[PDB]
């Protein structure tokens, strides 16, 4: 099915790979060669997460086995396996599922790429997506690699990965002091501010008090200039927000990349370079 | 699909020849691996 103005754009071609082979639509989703690959990676991935939930950490009859949505969890192998493929039932499963997830995300990105090529729009979205894909990779590929073992990756489970984040973070005593962490947090927050401000503005102008007509560019600028003496302007706010969100992901990726591989001591201690300068 | 019925015999002929070539090379590797290391 199509939007009421969609048929006029459903052109043929634009692939990266496949050409007319998978060059078709299904419902509202565009397929394409990377969608077929993606669907394969995804389906096998999920279906395997399903088998992991089915077997549990000690076998299907054990009390630790579970189908409870909050507790199902597939965790990596022990560190003793280093960068080798570990047995299926000993964190292997997690490795394969990971390969599938990474491949599905990279496929997804490439499919948005074929979609940009079709619609004749910029490739800002899949580029931006690639930052989340990057973040995911440090959290499953880069970091555990620099650390001589895939087991350093986080488990795939709704709360178990929360536990992972918790203990890895606390290995450094007071993570809040991580300076890249402080940055990333600031960007996630600022992102949240710009988003709330943009949202508010558009909705405040395109829908004004009853009795008033759709507002204008002049209104837009006059308001944020009235309140805080500046208006970065319409275009740019779309530019900033993209900066904030992509940067937030960036600094998260670097804030965790340095936690181990480039820093092993507690994090507040890092700030020592500041209490010890020869100024004081 | 920009093919004629005769231009699907030809491609099919060469494809089939090459694929059976692939499956063949495959059978060799499965044999050496089988000799040195039977798995069943």
């Amino acid at each position: 099915a199509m939007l009421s103005f969609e048929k006029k754009y459903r052109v043929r071609g634009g692939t990266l790979i496949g050409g007319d082979l998978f060059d078709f639509w299904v419902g509202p989703f565009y397929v394409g060669f990377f969608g077929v690959v993606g669907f394969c990676f995804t389906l096998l991935g999920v279906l395997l997460i399903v088998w992991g939930a089915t077997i549990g950490p000690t076998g299907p009859t054990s009390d630790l086995q579970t189908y409870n949505l909050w507790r199902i969890s597939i965790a990596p192998p022990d560190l003793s396996y280093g960068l080798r493929m570990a047995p299926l039932t000993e964190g292997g499963l997690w490795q394969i599922i990971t390969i599938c997830a990474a491949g599905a995300f990279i496929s997804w990105a490439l499919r948005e790429v074929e979609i940009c090529r079709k619609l004749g729009i910029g490739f800002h979205v899949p580029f931006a997506f690639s930052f989340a894909i990057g973040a995911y990779l440090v959290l499953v590929f880069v970091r555990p690699l620099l650390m001589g073992a895939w087991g350093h990756g986080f488990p795939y489970g709704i709360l178990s990965h929360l536990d992972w984040v918790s203990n890895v973070g606390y290995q450094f005593l007071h993570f809040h002091y991580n300076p890249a962490h402080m940055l990333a947090i600031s960007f996630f927050f600022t992102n949240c501010l710009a988003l709330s401000m943009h949202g508010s503005l558009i909705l405040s102008v395109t829908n004004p008090q009853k009795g008033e007509p759709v507002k204008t560019s002049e209104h837009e600028n006059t308001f944020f200039r009235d309140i805080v003496g500046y208006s970065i302007g319409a275009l740019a706010i779309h530019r900033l927000g993209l900066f904030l969100a992509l940067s937030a992901a960036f600094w998260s990726a670097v804030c965790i990349l340095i936690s181990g591989p480039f820093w092993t001591r507690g994090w507040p201690e890092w700030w020592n370079w500041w209490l010890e300068l020869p100024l004081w | 699909t920009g093919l004629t019925d005769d231009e699907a015999k030809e491609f099919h002929a060469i494809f089939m020849q090459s694929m059976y070539a692939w499956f063949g090379l495959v059978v060799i590797a499965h044999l050496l691996a089988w000799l040195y290391r039977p798995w069943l």
Binding site: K8, Y9, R12, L16, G18, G27, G120, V214, S217, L235 | -
Partner: protein
Amino acid sequence: SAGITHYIDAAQITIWAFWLFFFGLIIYLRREDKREGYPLDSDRTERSGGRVKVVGFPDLPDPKTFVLPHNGGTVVAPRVEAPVAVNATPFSPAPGSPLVPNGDPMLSGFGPAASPDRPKHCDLTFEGLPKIVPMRVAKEFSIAEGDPDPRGMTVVGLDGEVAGTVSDVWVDRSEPQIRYLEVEVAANKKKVLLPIGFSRFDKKARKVKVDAIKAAHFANVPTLSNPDQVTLYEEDKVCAYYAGGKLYATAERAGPLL
């Protein structure tokens, strides 16, 4: 008994409250999502002769009226839009198949070259003067100290051939900025707009590259029914043509790669 632990505590029932407000929220946002593009296009509607208008869940929200300032109108959403023929033919008669554009792809006005029919009137400043106008109409405007003046650079298409040269610069009277480049085309000395979004600068060279279309294509840029202002209709018509070159301007952007 001063200890009968209740199994339901304020946090449970508050997470329940949240989820209910959530569901109502999601639904509502999905209703605002159908103020355009709906009801959908299937061969379910056409097969049934129309007794199957496609809308899904939730349903469509009562029209809302936007009251444009300056004797502009009244717009509604959702609205009833007149169907429009497709300047293309089904790559396959099978459903979900794409269509190949009819004729010279860039002329087709289909695919990356497609666009809707926006008003044949102009966006306006607060005052009500044509928002987007050229610097020749907007006397006051001025380049920013230290920025090559686009005026006089050479516009060059995707294959390195000159297209024309910048004859002027269009600007926003509402949010001061370069919106359009004007191009005195070489091949016929006719004037066309070139969206900033499609133009790259080469300051040390005083050039204005365009990967979008080929030098020749600049000859077919959709035209203005008045050279001192532009209509909404015309903005779409102008940009979409260039966009087409992204998939059409070469016998290779068509993809594949392998």
